[PDB]
Amino acid sequence: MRPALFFCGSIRGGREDRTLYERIVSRLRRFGTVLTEHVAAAELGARGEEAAGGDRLIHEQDLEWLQQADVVVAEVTQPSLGVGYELGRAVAFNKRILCLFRPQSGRVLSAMIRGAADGSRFQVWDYEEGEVEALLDRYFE
Template sequence: MNIYFACSITGGRKDEIIYQSIIVYLVNSGHNVPTAFLAQTNIMMKENNTTPSEIFTRDTSWIHNCDCLIAEISTPSHGVGYEIGYALNLEKPVLCLHHCDTRISKMISGNPHHLLTTNAYATTKEAITRIDQFLTP
């Protein structure tokens, strides 16, 4: 499956270890994740050489070509919110994951879109379980 993984970059990187665990799990499960590099520790430096226009074109193309989008939304991010809305507008299934002790935007929690799933998790293992449930028809 072609999965677009979305996570905070400029909004904060406190959940980087979780991002990395999710990416490792998805890739090891045989999925193609074009955004896997977003979980890397030095992503801010790598993206500094890419223009905003290039990032927009690249990322929206990946969303167009993905089967679904999985977002870790514990750290607020304008970009991730945009990507979620963009994917839903294209009728792509979206899974939003967040720490169980984190308040998320009511624009996400109140969204009735039939392809949007939002799940809280307490551990990385639980996040992986939520991903499996989402990916299994």
């Protein structure tokens, strides 16, 4: 009955504010089964070069979860190759996509991502750190 929800976010974004990713995923649990290899990706990344096979396994498993997901939820405040790639695969798999961007960070969101948005299937919601639960509530109701 509940939709499957993939979550990822830059490894830098999660380290700079540990609470945020926890709150996003916690609130998503109100609304569906969450899939994410975020923690694994963070750790294997750190390990770097010698974690090659672990990278392969993560790629394959995230790819599996992207295919299972009904909604892909991406925190796109910090630049990330991995999040970008997932979104690209997600677009090719015809998923519904919700990107969460913090404009206060003083970054500007990639034009590739903004230009992908159509405000229906692919939405980008600009939010402030303290309103992320209200935002997810609005989207999933």
